[PDB]
């Protein structure tokens, strides 16, 4: 009745959310990133902006947030505010008019092994090159370039959870059918930072328009 409070107090007594959660600073933080697409909210063709409801699952091990379950009556998992812990600064590179990073700091699930699972919701309003040629029978290929903004690949390595986005919770859109989806990890060198390649995962969705509305009202 006081053991979970004791655990939280012991973990964070001198925890630092500034330093990376590794035993040794030369180690790399291995972050698993899984984009879950909940709903294709909008595809703004004229503004070339795609609005999507997503869950950006992030998983990593915090070396300092381990505990022994026997010390706390077998407590093997706890929920803690994400603002207290170190987090990967995943930024949507191709943001058009939304937020770059996560702003809804939900609680993370922390396990006795130090494994943190964070699944914050986000509404990504990403830029997409709307190809007009075959409209209204066009297929659109819209993508989300997600990566750690300040941590480079030698410092925090992000890895895709799966080759494809998690569409299991996808609310079927009445205008667009996702014919294909895939996630590709890339390392690229920016002119800002020529000696350190930065990792990103570009999730992409091949969306085909359902033409029936435009067939009826235009064609």
């Amino acid at each position, epitope marked *: 009745s006081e053991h979970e409070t004791r655990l939280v107090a012991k973990l964070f007594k001198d925890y630092s959310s500034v330093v990376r959660p590794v035993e040794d600073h030369r180690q790399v933080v291995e972050v698993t990133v899984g984009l879950q697409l909940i709903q294709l909210i909008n595809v703004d063709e004229v503004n070339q902006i795609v609005t999507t409801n997503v869950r950006l699952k992030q998983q990593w091990v915090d070396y300092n947030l381990k*505990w022994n379950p026997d010390d*706390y009556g077998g407590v093997k998992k706890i929920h803690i505010p994400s603002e207290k812990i170190w987090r990967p600064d995943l930024v949507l590179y191709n943001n058009a008019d939304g937020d770059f990073a996560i702003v809804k700091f939900t609680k993370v699930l922390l396990q*006795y092994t130090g494994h943190i699972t964070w699944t914050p919701p986000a509404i990504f309003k990403s830029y997409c090159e709307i190809i007009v040629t075959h409209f209204p029978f066009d297929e659109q290929n819209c993508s989300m370039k997600l990566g750690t903004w300040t941590y480079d690949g030698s410092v925090v390595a992000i890895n895709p959870e799966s080759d494809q986005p998690d569409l299991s919770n996808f609310m079927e859109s009445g205008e667009w059918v996702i014919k294909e989806s895939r996630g590709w990890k890339h390392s690229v060198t920016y002119s800002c930072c020529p000696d350190t390649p930065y990792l990103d995962i570009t999730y992409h969705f091949v969306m085909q328009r359902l033409p029936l509305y435009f067939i009826v009202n235009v064609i």
Partner: antibody
Amino acid sequence: EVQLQESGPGLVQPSETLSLTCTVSGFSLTSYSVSWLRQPSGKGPEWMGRMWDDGGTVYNSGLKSRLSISRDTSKNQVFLKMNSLQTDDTGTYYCTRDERIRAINWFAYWGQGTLVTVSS
Amino acid sequence: DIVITQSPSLLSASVGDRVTLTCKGSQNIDNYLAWYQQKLGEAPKLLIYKTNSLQTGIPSRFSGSGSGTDYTLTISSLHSEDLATYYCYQYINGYTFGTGTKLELKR
């Protein structure tokens, strides 16, 4: 500097209640946890429970019903009390000061240990 | 919890010999292994924690090594002071102790 001394009855009747006092010197119970260990005869040691620095307690799940732990921070004493004693409880009982790193704890110092024999 | 085994159960070595006691778990102990020295009728004394952190005041002849599920305690030169029983124990998931290795001077 740091020393711990277990004390208690060397012989206890079965189904009686064992009581042990871990006397403490060289440190304050308010800043160091005290764990209790026992080594049954012919077996490796096992962890019984801990008195936390904050005054809480935790017990081995096999002994949680049989154990209570308490302390007196003015006397620098930690008390173990165990009931429903059985022949298999015969062994050497240690109290240990626990070091910590964040939430992880380990036994850094041992007392000399008190041999407890349970026989009618 | 992580089951722990030690070998040898009994080891004989002469003063000055290098000895390497071994400790092996059933699961990844993640370097959260400690070693302590117990003598008959004496309070056990912690030698090493986190598999290689030497306890303050322990002679430098003691050193620890290992990773994953296999760990070792090395005495670089056995003194007569060091004839004792050595237990490894694990504190990352529950608390489990080895059976202990008893160390005797060779005769």
